[PDB]
């Protein structure tokens, strides 16, 4: 009977643990935790989610290959 407006983000559980780290630092990111592959993220930070997620993989993988 209640329909809240968020943003459904479907991903793997390893990425899902990285999205919750963004809500643990900058906060106001993950509204609700749905299941192991889905989350409820705020719609005003979805573009901020995609920009911050590319930064953490660039620091995790690195690999200059030189």
């Amino acid at each position: 009977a209640r329909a809240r407006k968020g943003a459904l983000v479907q991903c793997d559980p390893s990425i899902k643990a990285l999205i919750l780290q963004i809500d643990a630092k900058m906060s106001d990111i993950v509204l609700e935790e749905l299941d192991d592959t889905h989350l409820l993220v705020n719609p005003s930070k979805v573009e901020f989610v995609k920009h911050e997620l590319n930064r953490l993989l660039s620091k995790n993988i690195y690999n200059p290959m030189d």
Binding site: S14, Y62, M65
Partner: protein, 408 residues
Amino acid sequence: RPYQEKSLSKMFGNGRARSGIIVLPCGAGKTLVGITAACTIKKSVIVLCTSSVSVMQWRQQFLXXXXXXXXXXXXXXXXXXXXXXXXXXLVVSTYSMVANXXXXXXXXXXXXXXXXXXXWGFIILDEVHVVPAAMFRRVVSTIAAHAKLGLTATLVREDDKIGDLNFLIGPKLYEANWMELSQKGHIANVQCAEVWCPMTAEFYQEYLRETARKRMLLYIMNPTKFQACQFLIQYHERRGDKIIVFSDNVYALQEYALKMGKPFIYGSTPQQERMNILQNFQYNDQINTIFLSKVGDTSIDLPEATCLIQISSHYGSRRQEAQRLGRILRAKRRNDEGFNAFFYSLVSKDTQEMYYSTKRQAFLVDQGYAFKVITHLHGMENIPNLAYASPRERRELLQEVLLKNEEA
């Protein structure tokens, strides 16, 4: 071998006043080039080995040549010393006796007996990639011969001192391509593969909270890695191929050797139990999966087992793992029609070890070896003997690693 005469073609050109490095594989006769060069110059040759088993391998080449037990071809050791001769001496020495520091066991005076009576003329150094060090510069500074020579199989090191050998010993002269020598004698065709096993969600969040050398205890002990190890173990026994499992960590070697029910060779293991497994590996067919640390690869390489599995990998030494993996493939020669030497690496996703393992595979492209990627082989979903597959065993493995992180 024709590449040895190509290595000897530069010695027959100018004849006198030359010093360089010759790159020859470990399975190739690199000890045969030092014999023909000793019969050409005919002088007091001092062999610079590192192990006592390296002394005994050069003494068998002296028996194949001409004399060894006479008063000419000596044998410099810290237990006993032999006598040499003028312009006809073949002595093998040790790095931990000629250099040393102050620990003398009545053999340091014997080690300086041939380095003071002008008993030189030819310098032969075994493994020139280890000369980028510190005590190796004390060995070169105490000798002064007419010609020098360095013999090695690999020289890839990121210590930024391998380029110093061009003026210390000499520049590299002949580098033989290993893919071209694999067409001469089939020295096991390499198939570099990396099994991309997934990472569990319980071990992934606990991996990011750990750093230093304690974080590798969660990467190797991943529950899907035991599903990837036990699947590849049972896959090689169906093809009739023996397995040699490599691991840079001693504790992670014992964790994969005890659950799989296999004997192990690790640090500070007694030699009565070390040689007993080698009699069960080279003779008994029940032991086709051995687990070796860093002692059983730098001492004796086995020419069997055409399937190699790497589990524990350390950062930085990815070129040192390439020197270890290359000596196994060079030992595996018999020139078969197939001779598919499979190499696997159980690398978990989004861990700090798989991004350093790509530096190890990048060295293999420089050797000419082909590298392929295997995400998952379609057969691990049908193996009920995979440990830590059930979610109950993954939580039991999580508590054992969480107890391991509290101890470290």
